[PDB]
Amino acid sequence: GAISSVLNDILSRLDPPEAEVQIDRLITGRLQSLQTYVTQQLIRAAEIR
Amino acid sequence: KNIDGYFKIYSKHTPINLVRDLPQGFSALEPLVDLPIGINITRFQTLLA
């Protein structure tokens, strides 16, 4: 949902009070991405363990 | 095609050995030029010598 997927594209375009809004959308999404990976990787580890 | 006013033109020239209707094959067409015309297009013709 952010204006762009690349961090440098946002920081190089928007001001700090504007970039933090779009950057937070990527942090919220990329965090849930890694959380889903670690969540499923841990469950996969229990299967292999 | 017309994408956001940019009339896109692709091109590809390859040899063939054909004696009938359109040949069965595959080949990717490369961008030739980008023309920001911004005019609505609904009909088209073809020039013949």
């Binding site: 997927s5 690349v6 | 961008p31």
Partner: protein
């Protein structure tokens, strides 16, 4: 070449080691990207 530097090629800015590779860019292909939307290779604008 072969140095980790802060580059900027027409907005394609970031940190990476600039070096020449055996990639074959077509006349229209400007820059390359991986599946991560990360710039893999670029064409220098001053000298192509």
């Amino acid at each position: 070449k072969n140095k980790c530097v802060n580059f900027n090629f027409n907005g394609l800015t970031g940190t990476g080691v600039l070096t020449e590779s055996n990639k074959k860019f077509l006349p229209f292909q400007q820059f390359g990207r991986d599946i991560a939307d990360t710039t893999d290779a670029v064409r220098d604008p001053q000298t192509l």
